[PDB]
Amino acid sequence: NQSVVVDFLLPTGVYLNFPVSRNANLSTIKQLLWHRAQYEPLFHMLSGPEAYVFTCINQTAEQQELEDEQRRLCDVQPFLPVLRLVAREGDRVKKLINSQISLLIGKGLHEFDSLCDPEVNDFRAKMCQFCEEAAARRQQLGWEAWLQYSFPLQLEPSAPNRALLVNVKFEGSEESFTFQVSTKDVPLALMACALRKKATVQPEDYTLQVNGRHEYLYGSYPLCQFQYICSCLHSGLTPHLTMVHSSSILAMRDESVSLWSLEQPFRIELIQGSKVNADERMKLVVQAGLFHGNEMLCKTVSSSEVSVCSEPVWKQRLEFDINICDLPRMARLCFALYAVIEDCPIAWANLMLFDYKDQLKTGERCLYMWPSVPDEKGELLNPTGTVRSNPNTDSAAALLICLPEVAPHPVYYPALEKILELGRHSEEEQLQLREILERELYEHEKDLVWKLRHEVQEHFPEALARLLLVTKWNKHEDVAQMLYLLCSWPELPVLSALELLDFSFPDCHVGSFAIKSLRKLTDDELFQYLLQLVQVLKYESYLDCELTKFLLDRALANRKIGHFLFWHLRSEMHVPSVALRFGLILEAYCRGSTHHMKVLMKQGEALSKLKALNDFVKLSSQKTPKPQTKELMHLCMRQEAYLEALSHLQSPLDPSTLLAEVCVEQCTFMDSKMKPLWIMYSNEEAGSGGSVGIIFKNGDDLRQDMLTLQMIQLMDVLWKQEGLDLRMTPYGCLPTGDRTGLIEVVLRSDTIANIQLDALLNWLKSKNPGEALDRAIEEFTLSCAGYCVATYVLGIGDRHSDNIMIRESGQLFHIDFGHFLGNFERVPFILTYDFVHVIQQGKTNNSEKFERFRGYCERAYTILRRHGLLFLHLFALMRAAGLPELSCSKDIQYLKDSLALGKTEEEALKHFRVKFNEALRESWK
Amino acid sequence: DNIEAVGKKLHEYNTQFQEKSREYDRLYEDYTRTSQEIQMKRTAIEAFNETIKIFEEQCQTQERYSKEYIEKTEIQRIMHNYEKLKSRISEIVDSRRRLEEDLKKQAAEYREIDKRMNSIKPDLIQLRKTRDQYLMWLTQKGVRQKKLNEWLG
Ligand SMILES: Cc1ccn2nc([C@H](C)Nc3ncnc4[nH]cc(-c5cc(O)cc(NS(C)(=O)=O)c5)c34)n(-c3ccccc3)c(=O)c12
């Protein structure tokens, strides 16, 4: 029903309980409160209503001072309908922010306090200060700087001399000025002419905005390198721009025992299990082993068989074949609990032997265990898995161990000082190393590289990864030698650094070298790898790491990176294994991004209403047919709390797009399995793209779809980087939540299934009549090539009329990438007769056109091949994501073969042709 | 021991594996869902703690603010108002108590889901291995990929 009885606690101790409307905003509720309180005792002692602030317990279980009283009670969403009057005074800037953060990131900040963990608290102290300083620095600096922070330039790659017209206007002015400029005019030069026309009917006091978007035209670059202009040129449409004064941007801007002495074999005491749920006839074993990355430091020792029961007791020393001095910094003890007869992995847990301050841990630890999933690998242990405890401490299984007291004083892993102290002291051969490096190594080969490890540094600087693996990390002397080399190792290119971020290289010093080499990344490039970098955080041991700082440095310098950093982290907060890590990064981000918080807040509530809107539609689909369901959607949308929330937000898919006025009539849903929603906005000031759409899908995971699109966008950038525009449609796709995301709609488009009801060729004729049709066919040909190559390389199957889609421009594109890397064997290259028909303009034989198209496909495949190591590296890091079809070396193997990296360039290009040709053959039958 | 006989057994064993996998997958959904619900319950219980703290600070204030005041028929209104306050706390205590009881019941479900998973894992792992042993046996015997495909599923 509409109204709800709310409990009011006045600060005199008096108590009122009356009904108010869920719609009513807080300000309105105060007035009703004050009107009712006047007839209760102690009213004369209350100050005025504006002296006080409502307080509630919100959904995240924390108190919240409700400073914005324009908010509806249904929006505030208190836990129980209970409001306390307290006093305004206090540092309520810190109170407000802290509250909004808890609501925003999903997790309540108190949950971090509750843990009573130094590491957590230390992380929070350092990162929040660091972010806050960055933010305070940003405020002082110039508006130009601020514009660069907030609306970084969106440029076309290569990051041609014709000339066409352009409409420019001023802020708060109906009239506008159409005039000629060239492709190669810089943007300040353009501002000169409109500013001259102003005095008819001061150049650097302004910049240019793209009407109805937060995209801005500035800097030393020519017009045609900007996306909007480039887009306008290709469509033929005139640009539409606004001049905006510095003031207007400023207004936006405002609102002691050395470790190597302990030559004693490593040992732990296994005490008890807890909350174990195993088959009562079987009997329990705990297998345990030390690891450094992938590699066993020693032989894995095991427990005795105790009887299966909920609370099994062992009280067993497990000694290991390694002395305490030999342990490396990132040494990692790993447990697995099994059930055995007289086969079953129950659960596992991992533990860093040293802590975040470099201290060798001592005494009891209670490792709350994770359940084991049965899988292809089925290894003894799971040393790749996270080192954090399971957050379900109440109901999860657990293991009580004890790390013994090893020396009277505490002990740390030696400082960089003494590593260099130890590491200092220590053409026939060159031919063998050449052969081994220049071309999982073997016993024989590993031993050679280690001897010639200095020559590797001198002459094979790119082979650092090869050398790290060949180091014996279970002996401290070796470790000192490698690290010594590492500190004087030359900066490697980005491509090599990405390899080093993989799980195989857990040493803190290696990660530092990696990030050191990624600091040369431009924001445009960093953005291509943001997803991968985020997943790599799941490999980290400690919270405070070079990667977290790096990502925070870039998020704070660039608001677009900050945005996607936010959503990448936010969309996994439901996942227990990363909630804590991610939560802490999100808090730090927010604190240095109060401007963007306001935007991200609005988006999360759009998202929260859409979830509820989809859940209604789903639950109504069962009851009623579609047309009536379509209108019952519209009524729920037209509710003030919904409509306000769904209207006037920056798009999560691209923050420069303003979703302004929702068009309830044009909204709908598809009756597929997950019943996705189609939401249409008509934003003012935009022209041909004065309509924009978003799909809200809930119930499926969208990550594999995004990875695939990210990868296609990357190809498009690699191709565009050598003068080949293949007319792709790299539409936006963003996971925002638990099996929830958004997908950018591509208007003026239909599925081949529908178009086929010269079938394709006529549709294009009716969309490109007369002398247009030539363009549509070329748009089709360029894109067919791109999606033919892309889908062959990524190995995307299950292609059909229902999931290939055509634009009225001619451009073809794929949707709904369910499967890839040849998951339900090698996917052949694929030409449809339908697409060969269109490419040939309807002829049986059009040899001249068809060869251009073969060239396009060959140029495509060649370029990707030049950057094949980039795709392997990016894919290798994505194994962190735990996508079922991207779990192992074989899924990466597919890519090597698909790009034929093991073959020479011309050899590979001959295999492409034979694959190509048999697809041409196979197309008829 | 003949090829058709082993290939028939590879079909059966594959069907038993895919179905056993489907069962575990269904249980693992329940395990995850139950884990999200219980976290939700444990934090709604925190939300009950925090509310009740708010009501007991109110009670503290009602006594301190009233005692110092009440020396100066208003008395009867104040005291009944306090009795009405105290009465509402007992509703909120009762409701908290009901949730605690659900979380206890759902903890027992979580417990049982995880136990049912841990007795399937041996069957599931044994069926993967057997399936694979029959696959390799036939691949060694020279059996063509077409024939292996049609036995699987
Ligand atoms: C009402 C409603 C809800 C969802 N959809 N989806 C579609 C079609 C299938 N897809 C699209 N249509 C246009 N622009 C797009 N941009 C991106 C997608 C895209 C990308 C994906 O990876 C997956 C999916 N689909 S999902 C969200 O999983 O259902 C969509 C996409 N159409 C549609 C449009 C034109 C003609 C026929 C059908 C809908 O009417 C519709």
Coordinates of N, CA and C in Angstrom, one line a residue, chain A residues 372-463:
Chain A
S372 N 36.1 -26.8 -2.7 CA 36.7 -27.2 -3.9 C 35.7 -27.5 -4.9
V373 N 35.9 -27.1 -6.2 CA 35.1 -27.4 -7.4 C 35.8 -28.5 -8.1
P374 N 35.1 -29.6 -8.5 CA 35.7 -30.6 -9.4 C 35.9 -30.1 -10.8
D375 N 37.1 -30.4 -11.4 CA 37.5 -29.8 -12.7 C 38.6 -30.7 -13.3
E376 N 38.9 -30.3 -14.6 CA 39.9 -31.0 -15.5 C 41.2 -31.2 -14.8
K377 N 41.7 -30.1 -14.2 CA 43.0 -30.1 -13.6 C 43.0 -31.1 -12.4
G378 N 42.1 -30.9 -11.5 CA 41.9 -31.7 -10.3 C 43.2 -31.9 -9.5
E379 N 44.0 -30.9 -9.4 CA 45.3 -31.0 -8.7 C 45.1 -31.2 -7.2
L380 N 46.2 -31.6 -6.5 CA 46.2 -31.9 -5.1 C 45.7 -30.6 -4.3
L381 N 46.4 -29.5 -4.6 CA 46.1 -28.3 -3.9 C 45.6 -27.3 -4.9
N382 N 45.3 -26.0 -4.5 CA 44.9 -24.9 -5.4 C 45.8 -23.7 -5.0
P383 N 47.1 -23.7 -5.3 CA 48.0 -22.6 -5.0 C 47.7 -21.3 -5.7
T384 N 46.9 -21.4 -6.8 CA 46.5 -20.2 -7.6 C 45.5 -19.4 -6.8
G385 N 44.6 -20.1 -6.0 CA 43.5 -19.4 -5.3 C 43.9 -18.3 -4.3
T386 N 42.9 -17.5 -4.0 CA 43.1 -16.3 -3.1 C 43.7 -16.7 -1.8
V387 N 44.5 -15.7 -1.2 CA 45.0 -15.9 0.2 C 44.1 -15.4 1.3
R388 N 43.0 -14.7 1.0 CA 42.1 -14.2 2.0 C 41.2 -15.3 2.5
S389 N 40.7 -15.1 3.7 CA 39.7 -16.1 4.3 C 38.4 -15.9 3.7
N390 N 37.6 -17.0 3.8 CA 36.2 -17.0 3.4 C 35.4 -16.0 4.3
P391 N 34.7 -15.0 3.8 CA 33.9 -14.1 4.6 C 32.7 -14.7 5.4
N392 N 32.2 -15.9 4.9 CA 31.1 -16.6 5.6 C 31.8 -17.3 6.8
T393 N 32.2 -16.6 7.8 CA 32.9 -17.1 9.0 C 31.9 -17.9 9.9
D394 N 30.7 -17.5 9.8 CA 29.6 -18.2 10.6 C 29.4 -19.7 10.2
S395 N 29.2 -20.0 8.9 CA 28.8 -21.3 8.4 C 29.9 -22.1 7.7
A396 N 30.9 -21.4 7.3 CA 32.0 -22.1 6.5 C 32.9 -23.0 7.3
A397 N 33.4 -24.0 6.7 CA 34.4 -24.9 7.3 C 35.7 -24.1 7.6
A398 N 36.6 -24.7 8.5 CA 37.8 -24.0 8.9 C 38.8 -24.9 9.4
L399 N 40.0 -24.4 9.6 CA 41.2 -25.2 10.0 C 42.0 -24.3 10.9
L400 N 42.3 -24.8 12.1 CA 43.1 -24.2 13.2 C 44.5 -24.8 13.1
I401 N 45.5 -24.0 12.7 CA 46.9 -24.4 12.6 C 47.6 -23.5 13.6
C402 N 48.9 -23.8 13.8 CA 49.8 -22.9 14.6 C 51.2 -22.9 13.9
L403 N 51.7 -21.7 13.6 CA 53.1 -21.5 13.1 C 53.9 -21.3 14.4
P404 N 54.9 -22.2 14.6 CA 55.7 -22.2 15.8 C 56.6 -21.0 16.0
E405 N 56.9 -20.7 17.3 CA 57.8 -19.6 17.6 C 59.2 -20.0 17.3
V406 N 59.8 -19.3 16.3 CA 61.1 -19.7 15.7 C 62.3 -19.0 16.3
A407 N 62.1 -17.8 16.8 CA 63.2 -17.1 17.5 C 62.6 -16.1 18.5
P408 N 63.3 -15.8 19.6 CA 62.7 -14.9 20.7 C 62.2 -13.5 20.2
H409 N 63.1 -12.9 19.4 CA 62.7 -11.6 18.8 C 61.9 -12.0 17.5
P410 N 61.0 -11.1 17.1 CA 60.4 -11.3 15.8 C 61.4 -11.3 14.6
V411 N 61.0 -11.7 13.4 CA 61.8 -11.9 12.3 C 61.1 -11.4 11.0
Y412 N 61.8 -10.6 10.2 CA 61.3 -10.0 8.9 C 62.1 -10.6 7.7
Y413 N 61.5 -10.6 6.5 CA 62.2 -10.9 5.3 C 63.3 -9.8 5.1
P414 N 64.5 -10.1 4.9 CA 65.6 -9.1 4.8 C 65.3 -7.9 3.8
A415 N 65.8 -6.7 4.2 CA 65.6 -5.5 3.4 C 66.4 -5.5 2.1
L416 N 65.9 -4.7 1.2 CA 66.6 -4.5 -0.1 C 68.1 -4.2 0.0
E417 N 68.5 -3.6 1.1 CA 69.9 -3.4 1.5 C 70.7 -4.7 1.4
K418 N 70.3 -5.7 2.1 CA 71.1 -6.9 2.2 C 70.9 -7.9 1.1
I419 N 69.9 -7.7 0.3 CA 69.7 -8.5 -0.9 C 70.8 -8.2 -1.9
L420 N 71.0 -6.9 -2.1 CA 72.1 -6.4 -3.0 C 73.5 -6.8 -2.4
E421 N 73.6 -6.8 -1.1 CA 74.8 -7.3 -0.4 C 75.1 -8.7 -0.7
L422 N 74.1 -9.6 -0.6 CA 74.3 -11.0 -1.0 C 74.4 -11.2 -2.5
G423 N 73.6 -10.5 -3.3 CA 73.5 -10.7 -4.7 C 74.6 -10.1 -5.6
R424 N 75.5 -9.2 -5.0 CA 76.6 -8.6 -5.6 C 77.6 -9.6 -6.2
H425 N 78.0 -10.6 -5.3 CA 79.4 -11.2 -5.4 C 79.6 -12.1 -6.5
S426 N 78.6 -13.0 -6.8 CA 78.7 -13.8 -8.0 C 77.5 -13.4 -8.9
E427 N 82.2 -17.7 -27.8 CA 80.8 -17.7 -28.4 C 80.1 -19.1 -28.4
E428 N 80.7 -20.1 -27.8 CA 80.1 -21.5 -27.8 C 78.9 -21.6 -26.9
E429 N 79.0 -21.0 -25.8 CA 77.8 -20.9 -24.8 C 76.7 -20.0 -25.4
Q430 N 77.1 -18.8 -26.0 CA 76.1 -17.9 -26.6 C 75.2 -18.5 -27.7
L431 N 75.8 -19.4 -28.5 CA 75.0 -20.1 -29.5 C 73.8 -21.0 -29.0
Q432 N 74.1 -21.6 -27.8 CA 73.1 -22.5 -27.2 C 72.0 -21.6 -26.6
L433 N 72.3 -20.5 -25.9 CA 71.4 -19.6 -25.2 C 70.5 -18.9 -26.3
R434 N 71.1 -18.4 -27.3 CA 70.4 -17.9 -28.5 C 69.3 -18.8 -28.9
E435 N 69.7 -20.1 -29.1 CA 68.7 -21.1 -29.6 C 67.6 -21.3 -28.6
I436 N 67.9 -21.4 -27.3 CA 67.0 -21.5 -26.2 C 66.0 -20.3 -26.0
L437 N 66.6 -19.1 -26.1 CA 65.8 -17.9 -25.9 C 65.1 -17.4 -27.2
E438 N 65.9 -17.1 -28.2 CA 65.4 -16.7 -29.5 C 64.8 -17.8 -30.3
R439 N 63.4 -17.9 -30.3 CA 62.7 -18.9 -31.1 C 61.3 -18.5 -31.4
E440 N 57.5 -23.0 -20.5 CA 57.9 -24.4 -20.0 C 59.1 -24.9 -20.7
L441 N 60.3 -24.5 -20.1 CA 61.6 -25.0 -20.5 C 61.9 -26.3 -19.8
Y442 N 63.0 -27.0 -20.2 CA 63.4 -28.3 -19.7 C 64.6 -28.3 -18.7
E443 N 64.6 -29.2 -17.8 CA 65.7 -29.4 -16.9 C 67.1 -28.9 -17.4
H444 N 67.5 -29.5 -18.5 CA 68.7 -29.2 -19.2 C 68.8 -27.7 -19.5
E445 N 67.8 -27.2 -20.2 CA 67.8 -25.8 -20.6 C 67.8 -24.8 -19.5
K446 N 67.0 -25.0 -18.5 CA 66.9 -24.2 -17.2 C 68.3 -24.0 -16.6
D447 N 69.1 -25.0 -16.5 CA 70.4 -25.0 -15.9 C 71.4 -24.0 -16.7
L448 N 71.3 -24.0 -18.0 CA 72.2 -23.2 -18.8 C 71.9 -21.7 -18.6
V449 N 70.6 -21.4 -18.8 CA 70.1 -20.0 -18.6 C 70.6 -19.4 -17.3
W450 N 70.5 -20.2 -16.2 CA 70.9 -19.7 -14.9 C 72.4 -19.4 -14.8
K451 N 73.2 -20.2 -15.4 CA 74.7 -19.9 -15.5 C 74.9 -18.5 -16.3
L452 N 74.2 -18.4 -17.4 CA 74.4 -17.3 -18.3 C 73.3 -16.2 -18.0
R453 N 72.9 -16.1 -16.8 CA 71.9 -15.1 -16.4 C 72.3 -13.7 -16.5
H454 N 73.7 -13.5 -16.4 CA 74.2 -12.1 -16.7 C 74.2 -11.7 -18.1
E455 N 74.5 -12.7 -19.0 CA 74.3 -12.5 -20.5 C 72.9 -12.3 -20.9
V456 N 72.0 -12.9 -20.2 CA 70.5 -12.7 -20.5 C 70.2 -11.2 -20.2
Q457 N 70.7 -10.6 -19.1 CA 70.5 -9.2 -18.8 C 71.1 -8.3 -19.8
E458 N 72.3 -8.7 -20.2 CA 73.1 -7.9 -21.1 C 72.5 -7.9 -22.6
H459 N 72.3 -9.1 -23.1 CA 71.9 -9.4 -24.5 C 70.5 -9.8 -24.8
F460 N 69.8 -10.2 -23.8 CA 68.4 -10.7 -24.0 C 67.4 -10.1 -23.1
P461 N 67.4 -8.8 -22.9 CA 66.6 -8.2 -21.9 C 65.1 -8.5 -21.9
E462 N 64.6 -8.9 -23.1 CA 63.2 -9.3 -23.2 C 62.9 -10.7 -22.6
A463 N 64.0 -11.5 -22.4 CA 63.9 -12.9 -21.8 C 63.9 -12.9 -20.3

